[PDB]
Design a protein around this ligand. Structure first.
Ligand SMILES: *[C@@H]1O[C@H](CO)[C@@H](O[C@@H]2O[C@H](CO)[C@@H](O)[C@H](O)[C@H]2NC(C)=O)[C@H](O)[C@H]1NC(C)=O
Ligand SMILES: *[C@@H]1O[C@H](CO)[C@@H](O[C@@H]2O[C@H](CO)[C@@H](O)[C@H](O)[C@H]2NC(C)=O)[C@H](O)[C@H]1NC(C)=O
Ligand SMILES: *[C@@H]1O[C@H](CO)[C@@H](O[C@@H]2O[C@H](CO)[C@@H](O)[C@H](O)[C@H]2NC(C)=O)[C@H](O)[C@H]1NC(C)=O
Ligand SMILES: *[C@@H]1O[C@H](CO)[C@@H](O[C@@H]2O[C@H](CO)[C@@H](O)[C@H](O)[C@H]2NC(C)=O)[C@H](O)[C@H]1NC(C)=O
Ligand SMILES: *[C@@H]1O[C@H](CO)[C@@H](O[C@@H]2O[C@H](CO)[C@@H](O)[C@H](O)[C@H]2NC(C)=O)[C@H](O)[C@H]1NC(C)=O
Ligand SMILES: *[C@@H]1O[C@H](CO)[C@@H](O)[C@H](O)[C@H]1NC(C)=O
Ligand SMILES: *[C@@H]1O[C@H](CO)[C@@H](O)[C@H](O)[C@H]1NC(C)=O
Ligand SMILES: *[C@@H]1O[C@H](CO)[C@@H](O)[C@H](O)[C@H]1NC(C)=O
Ligand SMILES: [Ca+2]
Ligand SMILES: [Ca+2]
Ligand SMILES: [Fe+3]
Lengths: 87, 436, 641, 641
């Protein structure tokens, strides 16, 4: 959003806890079916459900964790992610 | 990983910020957390996550200093940028890229550029106009390190910067390893006004170094905050010169720089710093707040400036806290509080490289270099304290103590903490919104 | 479907594995084309051949261009070098040279001869016998012929004889004769600054870079007979034979006759452009020489060969495989590059207004293959990072190792000499330029030479197809890497090290500058402002959007004009054409400021002080001026006040 | 909501009906500011006043700029003109002048005096008595002072005295004294070509446009006493009194002492920019002088007044009414314009690289109100069509009739003189420029004068608020009409008539050009190629889409550089700065080619022929070069082959 020529700016944030303890951050997690039988290393070629292209807990943290394990070429990003995942 | 919140965006210039915050605030108090059963702000029957999250429970105002690049932090912006471009860095620890030192307001830039050429290339200079902009410029990534006093090492310590090296102010054969206990903060009055007392300073003219500094601002106005119980200090003093204040106070009505450079906290103001506050005391002030060594440097005909050659070291005098009037030569009777030394701050990842480049760099250009004119000196400046303080002998190595609360010590951190509700710098507010 | 980088270098490699360069190099050495001087009939036959090839490859546009220049050719009478005795009754001839020196003055002289090893100005400084009123002899190397004749003209010699020795040039034949030109500076000399069309109607002018003394190239066996009459042994620091001697004996002295005529000929440059799909009017020029005095298989054969095969490759990728370049590509064939590169200089001086800030790279294919050992590159520093990436992706022809073997290759890059064809593109017009050679440690033994053929090239280099394949891969990867992306790969931060090296080299002399009352510190602050400008531009690339086109165009324009702003405005483009402050000739450049400053310490008094104050002022404000232009708008500039 | 043109001129008229110019003009004639030379204290007080106004109007950026120049001021000793008899015992003084001539040489001379009516070169041609070794007197008019002193220096006179007569300047007072400068060319003369900052460290240089003779302005009653001693009646073609005489009598001769010193002062230019919303870095500069020697209400009062009120109007329209300009606007306040416009010339020579192809119009507010009768405009022809539309929309202040009363006003437009402030923007930097005046048929009687006040201005012109309202409406309608639309309103087809007039003026001399062996026909074909270029560009505006931005930017760039391509590349910018071929000074311009050609027919032999061949070649290829640059790309250029 803040890139040119848009030049926007954040003005009102929001908190997620109770009103006693406002929490600005939130947690990014990876939820799977029970007993599927793979850890984070055995993630290759599995079907994945992302919450959107460019969003924080859906795209940037999950791709950024497994990012340097992809084979070259890395550019463009979603092509090599499209080869890493089987759908 | 952890992520910042969802945010309402807006334009940069047209805004409009106050109207969004007014609307969402008055919506928050009536409709947000189950105040009305009729309408819900955070839920809806046909769709969910509409217009807001469902897991949100209230709104917080973003301070006006914080832009997007400061809102996301440095690690997350580096993650999204290296993820989008696609570099996956290698990081060999042998070589190091040159350090982008930060300077300010054209009297630091000349000496900085001269230091960039006298060094082989390891030091490059990027500048700002006030020190609050240069701390943010270290946070975003355009700069690397700078030298600050403890009042700003506190603020940059809140923003997420660590101190690497400290400045020693006493000569020794072993100064690089020996830790220094810190310099003293004094107030200076004249012999002509012998009626002055620390008990009664009301309606008297005061001279400060700048807003936010240790000996100029924190140590005096903390004690005066215990006595007056007011946050405002333009009411207790009639007039005075404190650079960096708001333009509407009288504390800018006594300062001297012009035009539109009045109270600018940089070297464009004549009354800025220690020596400039001493010119405030000589010209128009009744009391000054400076370090304990200000009078021996400026008096005795050491400055070639015309205002300081006629000044004597004897006739000035520095008052204690009980009300006793005691001369300049023994500072150890009259000191308000111990202030810690100035430090060099930088980010966490550039800690080792700023350490190596500055120790390697201070061995060449340091304090052993005589014949200063006709050569280069890093610490010797033209009486304006450019990039460092002029009495800095060497930069002490800090091991086991690299944290603002470790380095600054408990008493000074508590002394600023008693002034926590009173400070009006927007950058401290912007670095304290991050904390939940 | 779209093609990214790592697909596209693969497609280029699949194209290069098919082609055959050797048959084309043998075709350009055929009996139909084998002598081609400038303006000869066979040169026009090769020109029509290249043009019909550029039509058969189906390029987007093919157009020729012709203009009439003046060169110098041999007369029907023969020039000779001939020993004259003091007795005068008996006169002994040495030899009748086949080769000649272009733009030498047609005259005949007699005199005593002095050996003058290379004609370097330091070499001329360390002579034993004074030089004046005499004929110097030099060995060909280390500098252009024109700088030899210019230096020996400055010490008031009478004539120049040029030969080739054993040690520098090891060959079998000693009767071999060769060709050169002696014009200091480039271009057609009888139109300096303006082009040689018929629109100018040919006014009487004359360039300043022409000598007044007769020059001649002789053979090695000719130099043996001269060395048989001379005396006094050569110094041992000179890498030379036992044969050479210093000065002529007291009895005998030499006589040189040179008879040449000024022939006015026709010149054909031939061009062909592939269009672009996004920004069609920005382009990158790829060119190569077409004529040579002898057969010229090594000089102009491999350049024209790599040119034609690169045209077939890029037209093949655009028409079939789907390569869509964002900006156009001009292929060029320059003629008469043997007489000091007049095809490029007349093209630039002709169409300067049309390519002002439009063209942005010259890539030289000339002399691409000489040896198989090393890789020697010479460029403007805006291309440096570009070249480094290419050196990490091109495999060497003999061994499988990559080309990036030295991580400090940037400190060994030499500047562009005046004989190179990319030097008028860099110095005069302000376009970045690159020239690369697979050069052996010693230079190629015969360039402007009758013996330069194909067969002798193929006994020098054992296998040639893989080597010229490697050179074509490098140049094609330059062209793809420039024109495939929305971001130009010019790296503008390399000027920071150049300015740092210069200001350091002035900081050695801060004491003398302090003695004149001048401060040096404003030039420190100028170098600082250039650093803050380049850093601000890099953060503007950081905060920009890569997919949007309008915000990237405004940032690519500043990168395209960072080279133009180093062209010094304060000198005349007709009097001193090469006016780039880093790489130019004249008094306004930066090494002329240092070389003018070095004379003060010796206290001779051959330097002027007002000229130094004026050079320091104009150089300071030139660097400061480029720094203010690069950093944003007018109101964002912060001077002191 | 959006604002189109016919709403926007209505909004401007609603703004102009409110304001009051008279109070501001009286404020700039207050006792606080009433003498302001360059670098005086009151000039800096007015500068800080204008800057605080530019902050109170809330402009987008306000910045000052200072640099140190050298001017010439009066010495403590007094200069005088004084009659010396041949007897020498008795010496009679005429007068002690209050005013002085800037950049005159400080000296004292004696000699015989000769009347020299205007110092025009034709006027100097038709003298009776030869001029040399003598002191000329001239009347102020028809040309700048520097051209008078330059011409009388070229005929080797000793000194110049300048006065004002009855007929040209009808005033009551005869004791009135005035001010002028005698620098041929503009700018600070002690830094020619480079700016006068401290970054250049002030090298020793000296411009060529400085005289060597003492100059002095005298009063009319001083000229009466000189005319009482002289003899021989003036010719009747001279519009003059009965009083003037030709030469001094045999006994008496005059003595002139002039004592001035070179004072080095500080200069403040003060700037304020309104940003744009589409293309923020292209802009249009509006400027006006700030100082004057006397009170200067007519010279620098109305310029600063119209400047401040236009700033309030445009900032008021941008902040409130919703005017969104597509490209930025710079307001400027130049000081020391009285010494030959040094504020603009140091601004241009300082920041040339930063505004190269960025700025595209200068609009001069200086001397906007002199009389109430006529409307006299002087501009570059790219603005001509623009001015014509404005003359059809501005109502005259006295009568209700429009300004467009003559449909052939384009043939009566005179070129920009050297004293005008827009001439360094047009000739030197290549930016189009416009200057307009409500000028009476006779000129204003007192400009550089002590009597120039407000009261005498308001007895010259009866009512002033409506007149200055009309001038502010014209300039504001220029600025709106440039920056409101996506299409620039520069009309580039007006150069076609200029080139047609030139080639016609050479076609009168086709016989002599035929005698030298030169053909003229390539210049015919050059003019033709310029017509085909402009017609092709007009059809490219025809086939373009008006709403799209990228296809209109590529077509606006060629319109912005059609002025820059007339700047002749072949001359040095330091030696001859005003290098525009149509409007410049030197040997390279087109009227110097015609004036060099006219000398051949007289057969004197004071002309050189090689210079004419060289000028015809370079002028031909300059016109051809702009024509090739304007018409598309490189490959679309069709030369013959
Ligand atoms: C400032 O430094 C001086 C000299 O460095 C200190 O003098 C010390 O004096 C004692 C006397 O017994 C010596 O044994 C030490 O070696 C000296 N040096 C140090 C580093 O202690 C002096 O005490 C210091 N004063 C302050 C206030 O720091
Ligand atoms: C263009 O210029 C050339 C060079 O001057 C002209 O060609 C010459 O014309 C003369 C006329 O008798 C011939 O004697 C020469 O041999 C020609 N030179 C060459 C190299 O062939 C030519 O006439 C000019 N005009 C045109 C239209 O081409
Ligand atoms: C001294 O410097 C000047 C230039 O810096 C040299 O020549 C002068 O140059 C100016 C400007 O072009 C012209 O007036 C003349 O060409 C020269 N002026 C003179 C001779 O008064 C000059 O060659 C330098 N060297 C010496 C020894 O004077
Ligand atoms: C810029 O140069 C000017 C010279 O024109 C300096 O101004 C003069 O400086 C001298 C010595 O410092 C003194 O006469 C006055 O301070 C100035 N004289 C006048 C007439 O203005 C100026 O100080 C220089 N500025 C900087 C920043 O170095
Ligand atoms: C003839 O024209 C030239 C102008 O081109 C005048 O002088 C020559 O100027 C050029 C300029 O580069 C110099 O290179 C020449 O050396 C000059 N000529 C001489 C003889 O020195 C010259 O004033 C003109 N008039 C005459 C009568 O020669
Ligand atoms: C003092 O500085 C000089 C400067 O080169 C250096 O050689 C020397 O080691 C330094 N001494 C100490 C004790 O740091
Ligand atoms: C040039 O050389 C000749 C003989 O070689 C000598 O007579 C003359 O003196 C030399 N010139 C000068 C200026 O000494
Ligand atoms: C110049 O005028 C003087 C008279 O003052 C005269 O003697 C002289 O001859 C004139 N010059 C020439 C060149 O005739
Ligand atoms: Ca030419
Ligand atoms: Ca200047
Ligand atoms: Fe401090």
């Amino acid at each position: 959003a803040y890139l040119a020529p848009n030049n926007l700016k954040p003005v009102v944030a929001e908190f997620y806890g109770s009103k006693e303890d406002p929490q600005t951050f939130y947690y990014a997690v990876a939820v799977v079916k029970k007993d599927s039988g793979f850890q984070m290393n055995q993630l290759r070629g599995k079907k994945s459900c992302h919450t959107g292209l460019g969003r924080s807990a859906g795209w940037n943290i999950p791709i950024g964790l497994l990012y340097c394990d992809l084979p070259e070429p890395r550019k463009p990003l979603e092509k090599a992610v499209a080869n890493f995942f089987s759908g | 990983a952890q992520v910042p919140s969802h945010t309402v965006v807006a334009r940069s210039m047209g805004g409009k910020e106050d109207l969004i915050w007014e609307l969402l605030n008055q919506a928050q108090e009536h409709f947000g957390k189950d105040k009305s059963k009729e309408f819900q702000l955070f839920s809806s029957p046909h769709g969910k996550d509409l217009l807001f999250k469902d897991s949100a429970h209230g709104f917080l105002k973003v301070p006006p200093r914080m832009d997007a690049k400061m809102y996301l932090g440095y690690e997350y912006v580096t993650a999204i940028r290296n993820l989008r471009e696609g570099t996956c860095p290698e990081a060999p620890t042998d070589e190091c890229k040159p350090v982008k030192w930060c300077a300010l307001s054209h009297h630091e830039r000349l000496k900085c550029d001269e230091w960039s050429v006298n060094s082989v290339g390891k030091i490059e200079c990027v500048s700002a106009e006030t020190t609050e902009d240069c701390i943010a410029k270290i946070m975003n990534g355009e700069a690397d390190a700078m030298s600050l006093d403890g009042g700003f090492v506190y603020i940059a310590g809140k923003c997420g910067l660590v101190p690497v090296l400290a400045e020693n102010y006493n000569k020794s054969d072993n100064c690089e390893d020996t830790p220094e206990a810190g310099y003293f903060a004094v107030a200076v009055v004249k012999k002509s006004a012998s009626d002055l007392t620390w008990d009664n300073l009301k309606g008297k003219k005061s001279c400060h170094t700048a807003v936010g500094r240790t000996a100029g601002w924190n140590i005096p106005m903390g004690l005066l905050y215990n006595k007056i119980n007011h946050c405002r200090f333009d009411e207790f003093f009639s007039e005075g010169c404190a650079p960096g204040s708001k333009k509407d106070s009288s504390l800018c009505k006594l300062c001297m720089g012009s035009g539109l450079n009045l109270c600018e906290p940089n070297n464009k103001e004549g009354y800025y710093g220690y020596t400039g506050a001493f010119r405030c005391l000589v010209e128009k002030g009744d009391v000054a707040f400076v370090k304990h060594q200000t009078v021996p440097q400026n008096t005795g005909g050491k400055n070639p400036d015309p205002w300081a050659k006629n000044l004597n070291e004897k006739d000035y005098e520095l008052l204690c806290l009980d009300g006793t009037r005691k001369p300049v030569e023994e500072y150890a009777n009259c000191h308000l509080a111990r202030a810690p030394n100035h430090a060099v701050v930088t980010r966490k990842d550039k800690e080792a490289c700023v350490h190596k480049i500055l120790r390697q760099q201070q061995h060449l250009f340091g304090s052993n270099v005589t014949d200063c004119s006709g050569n280069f000196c890093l610490f010797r400046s033209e009486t304006k304290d450019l990039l460092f303080r002029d009495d800095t002998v060497c930069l002490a190595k800090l091991h086991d103590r690299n944290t603002y609360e470790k380095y600054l010590g408990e008493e000074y951190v508590k002394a600023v903490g008693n002034l926590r509700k009173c400070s009006t710098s927007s950058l401290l507010e912007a670095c304290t919104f991050r904390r939940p | 479907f779209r093609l990214y980088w790592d697909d596209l270098k693969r497609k280029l490699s699949e194209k290069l594995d098919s082609t055959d360069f050797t048959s084309t190099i043998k075709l350009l050495n055929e009996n139909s084309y084998v002598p081609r001087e400038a303006g000869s009939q066979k040169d026009e036959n090769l020109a029509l051949y290249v043009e019909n090839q550029f039509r058969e490859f189906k390029l987007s546009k093919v157009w020729r261009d012709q203009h009439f220049v003046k060169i110098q050719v041999k007369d029907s009478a023969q020039n000779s070098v001939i020993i004259v005795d003091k007795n005068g009754r008996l006169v002994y001839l040495v030899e009748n040279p086949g080769g000649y020196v272009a733009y030498s003055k047609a005259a005949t002289v007699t005199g005593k001869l002095v050996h003058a090893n290379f004609g370097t100005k330091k070499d001329f400084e360390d002579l034993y016998t004074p030089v004046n009123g005499s004929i110097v002899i030099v060995r060909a190397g280390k500098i252009t012929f024109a700088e030899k004749v210019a230096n020996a003209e400055s010490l008031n010699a009478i004539g120049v004889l040029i030969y080739m020795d054993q040690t520098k040039f090891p060959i079998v034949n000693a009767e071999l004769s060769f060709f050169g030109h002696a014009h200091l500076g480039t271009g057609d000399p009888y139109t300096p600054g303006f082009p040689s069309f018929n629109h100018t109607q040919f006014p009487p002018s004359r360039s300043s870079g022409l000598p007044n003394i007769p020059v001649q190239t002789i053979s090695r066996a000719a130099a043996e007979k001269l060395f048989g009459n001379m005396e006094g042994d050569c110094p041992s620091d000179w890498k030379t034979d036992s044969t050479c001697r210093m000065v002529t004996s007291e009895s005998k002295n030499v006589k040189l006759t040179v008879s040449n005529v000024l022939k006015e000929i026709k010149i054909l440059n031939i061009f062909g452009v592939i269009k672009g799909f996004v920004e069609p009017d920005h382009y990158v020029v790829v060119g190569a020489q077409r004529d040579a005095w002898g057969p010229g298989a090594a000089k102009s054969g491999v350049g024209t060969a790599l040119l034609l095969k690169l045209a077939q490759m890029f037209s093949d990728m655009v028409l079939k495989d789907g390569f869509q370049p964002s900006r156009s590509i001009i292929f060029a064939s320059w003629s008469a590059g043997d007489f000091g590169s007049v095809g490029a200089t007349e093209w630039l001086e002709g169409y300067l207004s049309s390519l002002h800030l439009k063209a942005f790279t010259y890539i030289n294919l000339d002399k691409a293959v000489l040896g198989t050992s090393n890789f020697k590159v010479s460029a403007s520093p805006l291309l440096y990072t570009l070249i480094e990436k290419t050196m990490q992706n091109v495999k060497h022809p003999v061994t499988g190792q990559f080309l990036y073997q030295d991580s400090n290759w940037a400190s060994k890059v030499e500047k562009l000499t005046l004989d190179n064809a990319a030097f008028p593109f860099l110095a005069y017009s302000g376009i970045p330029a690159v020239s690369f050679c697979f050069c052996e440690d010693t230079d190629y033994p015969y360039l402007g030479t009758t013996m330069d053929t194909y067969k002798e090239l193929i006994e020098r280099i054992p296998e040639l197809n893989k080597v010229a394949r490697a050179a074509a891969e490098v140049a094609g990867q330059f062209v793809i890497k420039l024109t495939h992306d929305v971001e130009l790969n010019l790296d503008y931060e390399r000027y920071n090290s150049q300015l740092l090296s210069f200001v350091r080299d002035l900081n050695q002399y801060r004491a003398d500058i302090k003695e004149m009352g001048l401060s040096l510190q404003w030039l420190y602050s100028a170098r600082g402002d250039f650093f803050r400008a380049t850093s601000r531009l890099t953060t503007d690339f950081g905060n920009a959007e890569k997919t949007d086109r309008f915000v990237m165009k405004k940032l690519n324009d500043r990168v395209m004009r960072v080279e133009y702003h180093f062209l010094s405005p304060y000198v005349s483009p007709k009097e001193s054409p090469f006016r780039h402050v880093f790489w130019g000739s004249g008094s306004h450049t930066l090494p002329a400021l240092l070389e003018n400053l070095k004379l003060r310490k010796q206290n001779n008094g051959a330097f002027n002080e007002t000229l130094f104050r004026n050079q320091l002022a104009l150089a300071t404000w030139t660097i400061q001026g480029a720094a203010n232009a690069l950093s944003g708008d007018v109101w964002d500039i912060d001077n002191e006040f």
